[PDB]
């Protein structure tokens, strides 16, 4: 049974609600992005209309085999009528193809559903500038002040400089980057660019990357592992045992691994600047945890909401405990009293 925070009142619509069977009264199912917690339930046997971005539509067809007749891609930044209701999709600054959805209800109410997002001041000059929002369905993943992390640009700067130093000191070092979903592609693409290499990966990951409309992608990635000095591996293999085993397979081409685990926030964020980050090392293997986030920091979230001034907020993350829900409601009230809406 579908929870209230995935239904859009006054419409036949749901958001990210594929794991509940046939939802009573749903005429169109929106999908914000291709992350498994959100698509959980879709497959080739699905027979209702799915509305999404072009990129999400490429992934549904090629990776999940949803039939073409049920995939409805919409352009971004464009007023569209769906089952008699005006909607707009906006870039969520999350993973490739991720959107926020603006719904203009027939009674005059305006609702924004952020999906998963990383708030940015650039959003203050989208189509959001032009009108009032009554209800905000908000990605509250990091809604507490202890959640700090650097910009994505500082993080990439750290990674490029680290990789370029190591491989210049030792031309026989291999760089490995972990992955388990779409998103965070800048980590491995930026490192391979500085090194003059394509990125090597499995056929399954190549296939996923080929759905993402990244410009000049054929110039950037490959399934030929031997030709590449930046490899991608599943996130679960990014440990001393998994990396040892990988280096064996490379046929004595390399004698050192430098590996990156992009994480979200970790408690080492509460003490250490990005500049000061050090790896875990065993022998000729070193592993860096780097805090590359595709969700809002607390401060970015607070800025966005204080600018938007919604009349009501409905959290979509951390909703399962009373302590979480109480904490989030307290911050929403501070923000509102501080800004005056
Ligand atoms: Ni996500």
From Swiss-Prot:
Region forming the signal peptide: none
Primary localization: nucleus
GO term, biological process aspect, one: interstrand cross-link repair
GO MF: 5'-3' DNA exonuclease activity; beta-lactamase activity; damaged DNA binding; zinc ion binding
Factors inducing expression: During mitosis. The mRNA encoding this protein contains an internal ribosome entry site (IRES) in its 5'-UTR. This 5'-UTR generally suppresses translation while specifically promoting expression during mitosis, when cap-dependent translation may be impaired.
Transmembrane segments: none
Keyword Phosphoprotein carried by entry: yes
Subcellular location: Nucleus
GO CC annotation terms, alphabetical: fibrillar center; nucleoplasm
Tissue: Expressed in brain, heart, kidney, liver, pancreas, placenta and skeletal muscle.
Source taxon at top rank: Eukaryota
Keyword tags: Cell cycle, Cell division, DNA damage, DNA repair, Hydrolase, Isopeptide bond, Metal-binding, Mitosis, Nucleus, Phosphoprotein, Ubl conjugation, Zinc, Zinc-finger
Subunit structure: Binds constitutively to TP53BP1. Binds CDC27, which is itself a component of the anaphase promoting complex (APC). Binds PIAS1.
Record function comment: May be required for DNA interstrand cross-link repair. Also required for checkpoint mediated cell cycle arrest in early prophase in response to mitotic spindle poisons. Possesses beta-lactamase activity, catalyzing the hydrolysis of penicillin G and nitrocefin. Exhibits no activity towards other beta-lactam antibiotic classes including cephalosporins (cefotaxime) and carbapenems (imipenem).
Family: Belongs to the DNA repair metallo-beta-lactamase (DRMBL) family.
Protein name: DNA cross-link repair 1A protein
Source species: Homo sapiens (Human)
Residues of the full protein shown: 700 to 1040 of 1040
């Amino acid at each position: 049974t579908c929870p209230f925070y995935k239904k859009i009142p006054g419409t036949g619509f749901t958001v990210d609600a594929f794991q509940y069977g046939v939802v009573e009264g749903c005429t169109a199912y929106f999908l914000t992005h291709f992350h498994s917690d959100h698509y959980a339930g879709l497959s080739k046997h699905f027979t209702f209309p799915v509305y999404c971005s072009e990129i999400t539509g490429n992934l549904l067809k090629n990776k999940l085999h949803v039939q073409e007749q049920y995939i409805h891609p919409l352009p971004l930044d464009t007023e569209c009528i769906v089952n008699g209701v005006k909607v707009v999709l906006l870039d969520a600054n999350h993973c490739p193809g991720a959107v926020m959805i603006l719904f203009y209800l027939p009674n005059g109410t305006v609702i924004l559903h952020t999906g998963d997002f990383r708030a940015d001041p650039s959003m203050e000059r989208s189509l959001l500038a032009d009108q009032k929002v009554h209800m905000l369905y908000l990605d509250t993943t990091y809604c507490s002040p202890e959640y700090t992390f650097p910009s994505q640009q500082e993080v990439i700067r750290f990674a490029i400089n680290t990789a370029f130093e190591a491989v210049t000191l030792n031309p026989h070092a291999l760089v490995v980057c972990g992955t388990y979903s779409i998103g965070k592609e800048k980590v491995f693409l930026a490192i391979a660019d500085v090194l003059g290499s394509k990125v090597g990966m499995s056929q399954e990951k190549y296939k996923t990357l080929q759905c993402l409309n990244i410009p000049e992608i054929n110039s950037l990635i490959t399934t030929d592992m031997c030709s590449s000095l930046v490899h991608l591996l599943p996130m679960m293999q990014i440990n001393f045992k998994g990396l040892q085993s990988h280096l064996k397979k490379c046929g004595g081409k390399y004698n050192q691994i430098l590996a990156f685990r992009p994480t979200g926030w970790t408690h080492s964020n509460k003490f250490t600047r990005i500049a000061d980050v050090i790896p875990q090392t065993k022998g000729n293997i070193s592993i860096y945890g780097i805090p590359y986030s595709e969700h809002s920091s607390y401060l970015e979230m607070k800025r966005f909401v204080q600018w938007l001034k919604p009349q009501k907020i409905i959290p979509t993350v951390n909703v399962g405990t009373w302590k979480s829900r109480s904490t989030m409601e307290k911050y929403f009230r501070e923000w509102k009293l501080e800004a005056g809406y």
